Amino acid sequence: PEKVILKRRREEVWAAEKKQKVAAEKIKAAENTKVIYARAEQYAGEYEAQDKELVQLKREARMKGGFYVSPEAKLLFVVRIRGINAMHPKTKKILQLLRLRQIFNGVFLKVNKATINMLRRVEPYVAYGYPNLKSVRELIYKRGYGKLNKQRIPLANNKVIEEGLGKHNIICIEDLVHEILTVGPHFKEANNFLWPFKLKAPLGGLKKKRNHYVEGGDAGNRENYINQLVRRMN
Amino acid sequence: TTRFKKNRKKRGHVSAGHGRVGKHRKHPGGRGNAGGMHHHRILFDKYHPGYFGKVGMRYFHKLSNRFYTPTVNVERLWSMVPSDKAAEAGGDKAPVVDVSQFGYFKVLGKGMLPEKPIVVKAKLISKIAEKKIKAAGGAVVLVA
Amino acid sequence: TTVPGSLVWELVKKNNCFLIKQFGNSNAKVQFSKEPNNLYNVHSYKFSGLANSKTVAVQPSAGEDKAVVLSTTKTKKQNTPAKLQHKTLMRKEFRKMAKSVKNQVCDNYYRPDLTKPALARLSAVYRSLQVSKSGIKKKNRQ
Amino acid sequence: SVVKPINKEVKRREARKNPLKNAAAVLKLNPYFGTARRMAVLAEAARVKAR
Amino acid sequence: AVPLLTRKIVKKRVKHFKRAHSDRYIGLKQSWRRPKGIDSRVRRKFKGCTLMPNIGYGSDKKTRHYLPNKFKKFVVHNVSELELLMMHNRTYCAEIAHNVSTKKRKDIVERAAQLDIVVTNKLARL
Amino acid sequence: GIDLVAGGRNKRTKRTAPKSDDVYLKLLVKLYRFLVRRTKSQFNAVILKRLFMSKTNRPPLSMRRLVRFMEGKEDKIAVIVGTITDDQRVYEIPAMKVAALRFTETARARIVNAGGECLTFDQLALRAPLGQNTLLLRGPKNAREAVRHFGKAPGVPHSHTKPYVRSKGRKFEKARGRRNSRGFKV
Amino acid sequence: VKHNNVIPNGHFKKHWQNYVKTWFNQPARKQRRRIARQKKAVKIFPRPTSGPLRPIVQCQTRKYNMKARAGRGFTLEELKSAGIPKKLAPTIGISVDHRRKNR
RNA sequence: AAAUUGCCGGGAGGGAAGCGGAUGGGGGCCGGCGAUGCGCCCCGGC
RNA sequence: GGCCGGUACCCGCGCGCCGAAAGGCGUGCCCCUCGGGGCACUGCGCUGCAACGCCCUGCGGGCUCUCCAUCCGACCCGUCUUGAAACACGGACCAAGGAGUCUGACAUGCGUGCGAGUCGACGGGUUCUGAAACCUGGGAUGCGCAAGGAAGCUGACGAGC
RNA sequence: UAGGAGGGCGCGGCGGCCGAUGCAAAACCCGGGGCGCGAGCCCGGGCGGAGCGGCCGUCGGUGCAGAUCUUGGUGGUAGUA
Ligand SMILES: [Mg+2]
Ligand SMILES: [Mg+2]
Ligand SMILES: [Mg+2]
Ligand SMILES: [Mg+2]
Ligand SMILES: [Mg+2]
Ligand SMILES: [Mg+2]
Ligand SMILES: [Mg+2]
Ligand SMILES: [Mg+2]
Ligand SMILES: [Mg+2]
Ligand SMILES: [Mg+2]
Ligand SMILES: [Mg+2]
Ligand SMILES: [Mg+2]
Ligand SMILES: [Mg+2]
Ligand SMILES: [Mg+2]
Ligand SMILES: [Mg+2]
Ligand SMILES: [Mg+2]
Ligand SMILES: [Mg+2]
Ligand SMILES: [Mg+2]
Ligand SMILES: [Mg+2]
Ligand SMILES: [Mg+2]
Ligand SMILES: [Mg+2]
Ligand SMILES: [Mg+2]
Ligand SMILES: [Mg+2]
Ligand SMILES: [Mg+2]
Ligand SMILES: [Mg+2]
Ligand SMILES: [Mg+2]
Ligand SMILES: [Mg+2]
Ligand SMILES: [Mg+2]
Ligand SMILES: [Mg+2]
Ligand SMILES: [Mg+2]
């Protein structure tokens, strides 16, 4: 029948085009994974160089007589530690902007004066500090979800980065981890891509959540100890 | 249609949809328009401005026949002309239309006219209607 | 079907005299259609024996043994009901009968939709005739 | 004549592979992970074999 | 006559949802009616009071309405309404309607045994 | 728990299928579900979302306005998801091709004797599956008489809303609140 | 009253349920009138069933002055000028109306 | 029909009984409550 | 060690051999150069994890049904109420009856018919089961198509951002 | 909670469709087996001895635990004063 032979003609045409498409994407993926290998290589290299360099300048300044002052953290990890009941409405709006809309959410934040004075307002409600490399990488792997089409996607592969990002020159999970950790030009987009991390309740317990950390509690800066905490929120 | 009535869906809900705190008693606002100037005042002076008062002069034994003047705009006149007597015409010859044969008295003037001449014949006309007809080249005959 | 198949469907999908629906209009609802020219006796537009030009019916026959009627509608004779159905009473063996049903249903492109379901109803009908002849020998619960 | 290539493909949520101690998946995420491990292990090799 | 179902039937609750207070009074039937009271500790859902149905107690969609037979039932009144189950007997189960004669049940069950349609009422009324 | 209004689920509501159980219009809905799904033509999406309307979201569009909107664009096919009613206040009309849900037998006679083409949407979906050379027109929505009675209140200043009055006359809402000589002017 | 509505004007304060007029005998009215007409025709066979003749007159009242309709009877002046005597026009099926004036 | 009562059999009772969630022990009850068939293969006829 | 899952894709399998089997087995490049490692060219198809039990009309299996025991929970429902278990009112128990309806005007929302018209509603003709149905009239019946004025009266000259 | 809307269960008819019924209908009873989150529904057993359902459309005097509710019946009280 003319109808069915025509239908199969188009079917064969599309079947040919899918085959050639998949061959092109195989070649593309083959070259793309070498690219990713290079990027991850030189990210590890430069992380290591920065860590050694800080030590080098600190000894150099000591031997020269004075002292070196470390350049403060560009990035904060903020996790909410109070329930959503009996909150002041200003606090409710501030937490809706910081994206901490449910207890034990943890978000990555630039340090700038607007943000840190927005944290000063909800300080009894948050625990925050300066994540280190292991913290950032293992959060983004073990609990990494993407705001793709407003839907949440489990970043279980490099592919989802290619759609959410990539207009921003982020292709891989290590590109994303770097460009967060060393707070980059595209950190706005590479962070609004992420979904507010869902954390476990803190294994080993917690201290009182009512006091500031300085008074013994948990809220506010624990500047580095957000490291010692994420290991138990995760 | 009882099966759609929403009371059948309020079966089993004690109040039948009129509230526990303030109930559904008989006439808590008076029978009808009551309290027009007292407590329904906001209502009558917000949604019905002009209700209360006397305006205008009385007319004993008004007959609606004496106020009867059905109108037609100029724009409707060419519909009154059948196609074959539109074609039986030229540049100088125009169809003569007696609107009273259609039931209209006055010929108002809303709308366009074509260049085609038309000779309307009515019981009343306005300014603008005659101006439009003359400007179309047609004329006017007054009858009754 | 003077009016097309889709319109007859849209006209008879909700109440038709061949439809047996039970258990109410809830999620429990059970729907079968019981017209002869429907194969799975499922009430849907694919199978329907009324909403279609081209339908395949496979019935165990009137009083006679091992004779299966295979009938297909004629697309062009729709408005002549006495002469709408092409029936053939085949008493051959199962394999030959199934070859014939493939010939009449799939290989002429009459209606490849029902290539599998018509052979499934053929299987069930043929064994129904077998057991109507012999009796229960297997219980077929394993 | 104008409709696009039909898309019969069902793409489901594919199971979670432990991205931290499932080496077969750590690689598809971070292909450098193997080399990163290898240099460190081969570094401790010298560090310990020395003494 | 062998079930198509390949998915174990788990039920989130077997005990019935009896009306609250059906126990103390005799005029109150066992059929559930939601307490609409304003101080009704059933409605306020104190722990220790008769649980109300939610949607959360729903059963799985593919394992819904299967008897322990692992067949969905279908009530047939006569042989004509039975012969429409030939190509479903691996997922549907025919039950004879409760008001048929035994003369007609013998016919239904005769026909069902040959068409190989599982029935749960082939020992009813005999 | 989590901080959301209504659990974040959409509280607005739109028609997703017509309430009208007209068989031909369900068939159109099927046809345009297919066209919008496989075709990606925004025009077909609009035709769809406008089949899912009331009749007071689909006002009639008359010949006078239709001719206004197709002076000089007669290689483009008019598409009104609605009704086309004629107009004796028009004299010459272009030979024009238009698709619409209904044609009053006077409008359709008018157009056919103008020498144009009177389509339905099933004919349109053939010669404009993507909406090539098409002119999508709506009718005047706020033209209905009920629309007058909407807005801010009839008796608040700076509002020109029509009041609900059971007859026009002198005795019906003219005295207090309608003139300085009785009370105040609204 | 309440939300913006036309002001109520129901004339339902008397005992209107004592004077509701329902029309369920309407078909029987039609059938009764038809039998009445049939038997009048049978009695007045072969007179015309329309009854006696009537005049073309104009309606009154500016609204209707231009519409002719049937009248009650020809004036004495018509009956005289037609050669149809006063006393005899009702005899031969022509109404007579002594009250009209011809102008 | 129910409330209500009698006999017969059983169950339990240190100033209430009844109800909900666990199973445990008693009973009463379910054979679609739970199977014995599938292919190959050799006759011996059908 | 705990809980869940058990495969139509992720994995995995065959397309060669050795090996009961985990598994090993080749070539060429780069790397240190022991050990040995990195990379490499890639193709077709297939694609519901296993082993052994125990019971099988039984003194079995398990039950959403009944009774009981134990543990934890557990105030009496309806109701006005800011607050009910209330020392607030009604309620001994069962059966049946029992409470937003129907009508006129209007309004918004929606459906349907037609659409500058639409109504056939009071009448007439017909109607062989019919208080039904069907036809008819309207050229002005109602509403709409034109509004402003208190009334005499006048009554929309054609839209741009 | 007040309140609103959507989808359903149930009762009694009407217009159609599918049927059950002295080999036992309706109704009612059960420590019977189920289905549904739920209104409810399906089947078995029994009494019962003549009518009854299910579906689509459509309608209405349609869903009871209360009203010192109406009527009828029956308890404890009590073999007591
Ligand atoms: Mg612990
Ligand atoms: Mg503590
Ligand atoms: Mg409520
Ligand atoms: Mg109550
Ligand atoms: Mg209400
Ligand atoms: Mg109340
Ligand atoms: Mg209150
Ligand atoms: Mg009130
Ligand atoms: Mg109050
Ligand atoms: Mg006062
Ligand atoms: Mg309360
Ligand atoms: Mg939640
Ligand atoms: Mg003012
Ligand atoms: Mg009175
Ligand atoms: Mg009793
Ligand atoms: Mg005893
Ligand atoms: Mg208990
Ligand atoms: Mg138990
Ligand atoms: Mg009070
Ligand atoms: Mg008080
Ligand atoms: Mg007290
Ligand atoms: Mg008191
Ligand atoms: Mg009181
Ligand atoms: Mg009392
Ligand atoms: Mg009752
Ligand atoms: Mg009219
Ligand atoms: Mg504009
Ligand atoms: Mg009632
Ligand atoms: Mg009744
Ligand atoms: Mg009661």
HEC string of chain A equals CHHHHHHHHHHHHHHHHHHHHHHHHHHHHHHHHHHHHHHHHHHHHHHHHHHHHHHHHHHHHHHHCCCCCCCCCCEEEEEECCCCCCCCHHHHHHHHHCCCCECCEEEEEECCHHHHHHHCCCHHHEEEECCCHHHHHHHHHHCCEEEECCEEEECCCCHHHHHHCCCCCCCCHHHHHHHHHCCCCCHHHHHHCECCEECCCCCCCCCCCCCEHHHCCCEEECCCCHHHHHCCCC
The rounded Å distance from CA F9 to ligand 7 centre is 29
> Torsions phi, psi of B19, nearest 5?
100, 145
Nearest nucleotide to E51 (CA to C1') is: H20
What 8-state DSSP symbol labels residue F143? G
Helix axes F23-39, C5-12, angle to 10 degrees: 120
Read off the amino acid at residue E106. Answer: K
Burial class (CB in 10 A: 0-12, 13-18, 19+), B53: middle
Rounded Cα gap, residues E73 and E67, in angstroms = 7
Q: Tell me whether A90 touches chain F (CB under 8 Å).
A: no
Find all residues with CB under 8 Å of C47, minimum gap 6, and list them.
C33, C38, C39, C40, C41, C114, C117
The answer to whether C115 and C107 are in contact (CB under 8 A) is: no
Rounded to whole angstroms, the distance from the CA of residue A48 to the C1' of nucleotide I67 is 76
Q: For residue F111, which amino acid is it?
A: I
Minimal C-alpha gap between B22 and chain F (Å): 28
Q: How far away is chain G from the Cα of B115, in angstroms, using its nearest Cα?
A: 32
| Structure tokens belonging to residue G78 | 């018509």
Chains touching B, CB cut-off 8 Å, 3+ pairs: E, F, G
CA distance F43 to chain A (A): 23
* Structure tokens belonging to residue G28: 């029987």
Read off the tokens for B73.
């705009």
Cβ under 8 Å to C: F residues 14-43 = 23-24, 26-27, 30
The Cα B140–Cα B120 span in angstroms is: 5
Contact in structure between C129 and C66 (CB atoms under 8 Å): yes
The token duo for A71 is 């350049």
How close is the nearest chain F Cα to the Cα of G5, in Å? 6
Angle (CA) A114-A118-A122 rounded to 5° is 170
Phi, psi angle pair for C59, to nearest 5°: -120, 140
Contact F1 A95 (CB under 8 A): no
Tell me how far CA of residue D48 lies from CA of D39, D40, D41, D51, in angstroms.
14, 12, 10, 6
Per-residue tokens: B33: 């328009």
- Residue E14 CA to chain centroid, in angstroms? 12
Residue whose structure tokens are 């592919």: A159
Contact D30 A33 (CB under 8 A): no
Minimal Cα distance from C5: which residue of F? F27
CB contact under 8 A, F166 and G5: no
Residues 30-49 of E with CB under 7 A from strand H: 48-49
Nearest neighbour of A141 by CB, restricted to D19, D28, D31? D19
Give B116's DSSP letter.
Answer: S
Give the residue on G whose Cα is nearest the Cα of B35: G1
Structure tokens at C54: 């081209």
**Residue G92 in contact with residue G46, Cβ under 8 Å?**
no
Residue B21 Cα to ligand 21 middle (Å): 25
Query: What resolution (Å)?
Result: 3.4
E111 touches strand H (CB under 7 A): no
Residue C67, Cβ neighbours under 10 Å: how many? 15
Spatial distance between the Cα atoms of A218 and F120, rounded to a whole number of angstroms: 70
| Amino acid identity at D19 | P
Written as one string, the DSSP assignment of C90-125 is E-S-HHHHHHHHHHHHTTT-S-GGGHHHHHHHHHHH
Q: CA of F65 vs C1' of J24, distance in Å?
A: 76
Q: Are F102 and F83 in contact (CB under 8 A)?
A: yes
Cα distances from A189 to residues A101, A174, B51, F13, G36, in angstroms, run: 20, 16, 63, 32, 94
Short-list F161, F167, F165, CA closest to F186: F161
Token digits of residue E9: 């039937």
The two three-digit tokens of residue F59, written as one number:
């006002």
Helix axes F42-51, F23-39, angle to 10 degrees: 150
Beta bridge partners of C6: none
The residue type found at E93 is C
CB of C79 within 7 Å of some strand H atom:
no
Q: How was this structure determined?
A: cryo-EM
E strand or H helix at D47: helix D33-50
Strand I close to G91 by CB, under 7 A: no
At residue E72, the 3 state secondary structure works out as: strand
d(CA C115, CA E97): 35
Which run of H or E residues covers position B46?
helix B41-46
CA distances to F154, F166, F175, F176 from B56, in Å = 22, 18, 9, 13
| Token couple for F14 | 């739109």
For residues E126 and E104, the answer to whether their CB atoms sit within 8 Å is no
Q: For the purposes of burial, counting CB atoms within 10 Å of the CB of A158, is it exposed (0-12), middle (13-18) or buried (19 or more)?
A: buried
Give the integer Cα–Cα distance in Å for F124 and F137.
Answer: 14
Q: Do chains B and F touch (3 or more CB pairs under 8 A)?
A: yes
Question: Are F186 and B49 in contact, with CB atoms under 8 Å apart?
Answer: yes
User: Does the bond joining G46 to the residue before it have cis omega, within 30 degrees of 0?
Assistant: yes
Cβ-based neighbour number of residue A212 at 10 Å = 15
CA of C21 to C1' of J49 (A): 32
